[PDB]
Design a protein around this ligand. Structure first.
Ligand SMILES: O=C(/C=C/c1ccc(O)cc1)c1ccc(O)cc1O
Ligand code: NA
Ligand code: NA
Ligand code: NA
Length: 133
């Protein structure tokens, strides 16, 4: 008997940052989402939990990917913007929304991590209220 001692928690593969067969465009709004919106969120004091795919192994959250089936994070978003992955700003905004919503689903109001997400979301909403064009 192995007693399943070899079955260890692993992370799923991260979201794709490149898809040659996905149509893409460079728009002023997408340029702005990278240069302004993401870059200022990235420098925020609370950005660090969000700067890379959730590492459920390192953080000892083996339940995370049982609960969260559409993971998203700002490292993935940053790479998608730098790689010209998106067709339009709304596709990128959707990824930001997923990242925030995942945090509120997995956690509970009043948790430090939720306060962090809430603060980043408020800045995000302020920055995207006016896009170019
Ligand atoms: O997910 C992360 C941190 C979550 C978290 C949860 C509760 C807190 O109070 C603070 C941070 C995280 C942090 C660093 C990293 O390299 C990979 C990660 O996945
Ligand atoms: Na661990
Ligand atoms: Na793009
Ligand atoms: Na703006």
């Amino acid at each position: 008997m192995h007693h399943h001692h070899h079955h260890m928690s692993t992370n799923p593969p991260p979201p794709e940052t490149s898809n040659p067969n996905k149509p893409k465009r460079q728009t002023n709004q997408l340029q702005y989402l990278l240069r302004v919106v993401l870059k200022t969120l990235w420098k925020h004091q609370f950005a660090w939990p969000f700067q890379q795919p959730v590492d459920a192994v390192k953080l000892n959250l083996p339940d995370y990917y049982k609960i969260i089936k559409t993971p998203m994070d700002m490292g993935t978003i940053k790479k998608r913007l730098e790689n010209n992955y998106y067709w339009n700003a709304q596709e990128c905004i959707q990824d930001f929304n997923t990242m925030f919503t995942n945090c509120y689903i997995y956690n509970k109001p009043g948790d430090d991590i939720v306060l962090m997400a809430e603060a980043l979301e408020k800045l995000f909403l302020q920055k995207i209220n006016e896009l170019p064009t």
